[PDB]
From Swiss-Prot:
Functional note: Seems to act as a scaffold protein in multiple signaling pathways. Modulates excitatory synaptic transmission and dendritic spine morphology. Binds to actin filaments (F-actin) and shows cross-linking activity. Binds along the sides of the F-actin. May play an important role in linking the actin cytoskeleton to the plasma membrane at the synaptic junction. Believed to target protein phosphatase 1/PP1 to dendritic spines, which are rich in F-actin, and regulates its specificity toward ion channels and other substrates, such as AMPA-type and NMDA-type glutamate receptors.
Annotated region described as Interaction with RGS2, given as residue ranges: 4-36
Annotated protein name in UniProt: Neurabin-2
Lineage: Eukaryota, Metazoa, Chordata, Craniata, Vertebrata
PTM note: Dephosphorylation of these residues is mediated by PP1 and possibly PP2A. Phosphorylation of spinophilin disrupts its association with F-actin, but does not affect its binding to PP1.
Range covered out of full length: 493 to 602 of 817
């Protein structure tokens, strides 16, 4: 499996963006910090919903010129304000996972020799 680090380029309206973020994740390791400021919502009023770029299941891994990795939600909210009107982000979603081994798992139960 992997995180799909795909480039996301939005175009904001005169309104701006139309999303929200949320501070999820656990592991404030102090100098690594495996946190995830994922998209909390993607408001229909804004360009993000109408474009279909930043989706509610996406994660801001890095912005045009600033790596996130796992910051505080305030940091992420602020990076989008420090950046230009159009910036490419690298969204990294953990798309795969439910591929196999779900619920029942593999579980070598029929082999106990």
């Amino acid at each position: 499996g992997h995180m799909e680090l795909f480039p996301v380029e939005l175009e904001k309206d005169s309104e701006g963006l139309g999303i929200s973020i949320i501070g999820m994740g656990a592991g404030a390791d102090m100098g690594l910090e495996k946190l995830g400021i994922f998209v909390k919502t993607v408001t229909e009023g804004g360009a993000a919903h109408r474009d279909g770029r930043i989706q509610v299941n996406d994660l801001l891994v890095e912005v045009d010129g600033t790596s996130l990795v796992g910051v505080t939600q305030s940091f992420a909210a602020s990076v989008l304000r420090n950046t230009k009107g159009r910036v490419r982000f690298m969204i990294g979603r953990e798309r795969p996972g439910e591929q196999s081994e779900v619920a029942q798992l593999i579980q070598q139960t029929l082999e106990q020799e």
